[PDB]
């Protein structure tokens, strides 16, 4: 079953916002998501320290990053400490309906599009390049899930049975046609030294066959 | 009772590299520490929204920032979840031991004092300014305790019993002789300026009587 929701009303109005207003310097997108790949790795880093057992689900803590030029997708996945299915349905996680307030009104004081990251909603920059999202996400507490959105208010929930990831979060962009740059390999490289160089997790950048 | 620890190796040999290493610009500092705040306020903004009693313990969400001249004490105060003792302990809810053996790693490869924060140890830079550093913190699940460190290999942990916070964390950085320009109104002003201008939560500086 596929399970479909409304987005509060000012993350629907914050998501519009990123995919209407002109900002040509697009690829922060990218930063945004590796930032939050090392946020869920510390947590699962800090909650092992105190269970060992909660890394059953896989010890290696990484960041890959996954160009596909057939699909026209880029897919960033982690190990990180993943998300339950309420973590999912509710903003992923962020404290979205307070931050969007906070940045919006940031907006109108001189605050630039470039830190959205700041009031914790840096994921739907992932819309500065992507026409739909999809996150598949598993915590060691929860089953495996795939949330879904190509913006227009709503989103989608559903159970993910296919490949298991053992524990961590998939974050699937499905490129706008005009954004196939953020596919190329020296693309990719040239960002994650510009925005990520120095970060406590290896980042691996798969080539293509 | 007070309970003396000794930091765990890595800690102690960050600790000292950000104590004799030159370096000018100090004032990163209070970005990390603001940082932090800002972090522990999300927190509890987060699971507030699951269980609104969580903030029975005050349901304001603000830095305060507090200079001293007379005590030479620079205060930063947050209403964010706070700490257990526990959490204190366990390098005060950091990933200490990994991030420290990142960034080491990470400085020896072009990287810089101003970037320890994206290894999730910024609380430290307190101790460029800083020759004491004390934490009092109170979480919804533990009682009031008081974190001290001169640095020198040692930390201390008590009960807090005088005046409650209600929640949160308050970081007391008794500041170096030399490093007082830090408790000056129109320092702190350019700091908060430059380096955190734009952030999800509102920071008063008092003023001094
Ligand atoms: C939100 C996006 C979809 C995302 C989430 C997680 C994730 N997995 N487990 C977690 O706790 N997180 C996480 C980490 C940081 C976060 C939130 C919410 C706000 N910030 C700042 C959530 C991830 O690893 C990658 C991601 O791109
Ligand atoms: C660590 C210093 C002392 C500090 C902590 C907290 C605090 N209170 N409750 C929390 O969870 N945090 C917190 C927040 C962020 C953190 C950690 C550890 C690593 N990062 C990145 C801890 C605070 O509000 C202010 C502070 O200066
Ligand atoms: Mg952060």
Same mark, same amino acid.
């Given at each position: 079953?596929?399970?479909?929701?409304?987005?509060?009303?000012?993350?629907?109005?914050?998501?519009?916002?990123?995919?209407?207003?002109?900002?040509?310097? #697009?690829?922060?997108?990218?930063?945004? !998501?590796?930032?939050?790949?090392?946020?869920? !790795?510390? #947590?699962?880093?800090?909650?092992? @320290?105190?269970?060992?057992?909660?890394? +059953?689900?896989?010890?290696?803590?990484?960041?890959?990053?996954?160009?596909?030029?057939?699909?026209?997708?880029?897919?960033?996945?982690?190990? *990180? %400490?993943? &998300?339950?299915?309420? +973590?999912?349905?509710?903003?992923?996680?962020? %404290?979205? $309906?307070? *931050?969007?307030?906070?940045? &919006?009104?940031? @907006?109108?004081? *001189?605050? +630039?599009?470039? &830190?959205?990251?700041?009031?914790?909603?840096?994921?739907?920059?992932?819309?500065?390049?992507?026409?739909?999202?999809?996150?598949?996400? $598993?915590?060691?507490?929860?089953?495996?899930?795939?949330?879904?959105?190509?913006?227009?208010?709503?989103?989608?929930?559903?159970?993910?049975?296919? =490949?298991?990831?053992?524990? *961590?979060? $998939?974050? %699937? !962009?499905? @490129?706008?046609? +005009?954004?196939? =740059?953020?596919?190329?390999?020296?693309?990719? #490289? =040239?960002?994650? #030294?510009?925005?990520?160089?120095?970060?406590?997790?290896?980042?691996? @950048?798969?080539?293509?066959?």
């Amino acid at each position: 079953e596929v399970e479909t929701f409304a987005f509060q009303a000012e993350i629907a109005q914050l998501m519009s916002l990123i995919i209407n207003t002109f900002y040509s310097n #697009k690829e922060i997108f990218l930063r945004e !998501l590796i930032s939050n790949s090392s946020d869920a !790795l510390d #947590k699962i880093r800090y909650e092992s @320290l105190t269970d060992p057992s909660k890394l +059953d689900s896989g010890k290696e803590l990484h960041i890959n990053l996954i160009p596909n030029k057939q699909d026209r997708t880029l897919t960033i996945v982690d190990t *990180g %400490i993943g &998300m339950t299915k309420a +973590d999912l349905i509710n903003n992923l996680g962020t %404290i979205a $309906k307070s *931050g969007t307030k906070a940045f &919006m009104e940031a @907006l109108q004081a *001189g605050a +630039d599009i470039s &830190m959205i990251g700041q009031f914790g909603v840096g994921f739907y920059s992932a819309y500065l390049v992507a026409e739909k999202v999809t996150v598949i996400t $598993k915590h060691n507490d929860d089953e495996q899930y795939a949330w879904e959105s190509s913006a227009g208010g709503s989103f989608t929930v559903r159970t993910d049975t296919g =490949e298991p990831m053992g524990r *961590g979060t $998939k974050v %699937i !962009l499905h @490129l706008k046609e +005009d954004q196939t =740059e953020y596919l190329e390999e020296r693309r990719i #490289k =040239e960002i994650v #030294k510009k925005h990520s160089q120095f970060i406590g997790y290896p980042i691996t @950048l798969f080539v293509e066959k």
